[PDB]
Amino acid sequence: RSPFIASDQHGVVYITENKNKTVVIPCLGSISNLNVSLCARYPEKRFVPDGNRISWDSKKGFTIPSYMISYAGMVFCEAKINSYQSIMYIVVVVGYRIYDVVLSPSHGIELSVGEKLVLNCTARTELNVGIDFNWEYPSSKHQHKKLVNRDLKTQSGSEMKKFLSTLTIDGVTRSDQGLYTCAASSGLMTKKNSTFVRVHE
């Protein structure tokens, strides 16, 4: 039916951090002698090969410096003989950096049996980042545990995102005494931080 041949009816494109700064849309063509452009939206923008930098190879698909399509919700290559087009590829801009993981309180947690423990883990990251938290604590034997994950607003407008995970134990016991390690995970990158919670009479 179509010159373009690429699994699903829609594909995915990820703008990870440069270089190359160039992203590849796999618009693999059935023919070689085709004048292909890259259509991005919204708003509508058309991008035309300027060898060498922007280019379409019939074996590699379209290649564009990713800053030009980062704004976009979705892209697709368009070839015309007299107008065919590829499948829609969703643009996902993906951050990965975590600046710092900080616990609160940071140091010297002294508690007595029955007291409330409240750990605040906070991860600060670059933009286009989401985080999954994974905690590690002495009593993986479940006893009155509670975990709440929140979005705090950096803005400010700074250039960052700030995330909060909050551990809670209502009646600490001596089994719960030990190392508490909160892990923050963004894309692939992962940063850990820990404090010692001491429990005695």
Partner 1 sequence: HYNTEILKSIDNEWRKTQCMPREVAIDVGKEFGVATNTFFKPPCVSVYRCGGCCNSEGLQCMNTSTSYLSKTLFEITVPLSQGPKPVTISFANHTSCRCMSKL
Residue among 35 and 70 whose Cβ is closer to partner 1 = 70
- CA–CA separation, 111 vs 121, rounded Å? 18
Please give the distance of CA 66 from its chain centroid, rounded to a whole number.
Answer: 17
Task: Based on the shown chain and the rule CB under 8 A, indicate whether residue 66 belongs to the binding site for partner 1.
Answer: no
The answer to whether 73 and 41 are in contact (CB under 8 A) is yes
- 8 A C-beta contact, residue 98 and residue 67: no
With binding defined as CB under 5 A, does residue 39 bind Hg ion?
A: yes
90: part of which helix (H) or strand (E)?
strand 88-93
Q: Please choose, out of 12-20, 40-48, 79-87, 132-140, the segment that lies near Hg ion by the rule CB under 5 A.
A: 40-48
159-178 positions binding partner 1, by CB under 8 A: 159, 161, 163, 165
Contact pattern for Hg ion over residues 42 through 81, marking x by CB under 5 A: ----x-----------------------------------
In the set 1, 19, 33, 42, which binds partner 1 (CB under 8 A)? 42
The entry of Hg ion, partner 1, none that residue 153 binds, CB within 5 to 8 Å by partner kind: none
Using CB under 5 A as the binding criterion, the count of chain residues that bind Hg ion stands at 2
Q: Which amino acid is at 176?
A: D
By a kind-dependent CB cut-off of 5 to 8 A, residue 149 interacts, out of Hg ion, partner 1, none, with: partner 1
Beta bridge partners of 17: none
At position 3, the amino acid (one-letter code) is: P
Q: How many residues bind partner 1 (CB under 8 A)?
A: 38
- Residue pair 185/99 in contact (Cβ under 8 Å)? The answer is no
* Number of separate helices (H) and strands (E) present in the chain: 0, 17
Q: Are 119 and 113 in contact (CB under 8 A)?
A: no
Site of interaction with partner 1 (CB under 8 A) = 8-10, 12, 15, 41-43, 70-74, 88, 90-94, 127-133, 149-151, 157, 159, 161, 163, 165, 185-188
Site of interaction with Hg ion (CB under 5 A) = 39, 46
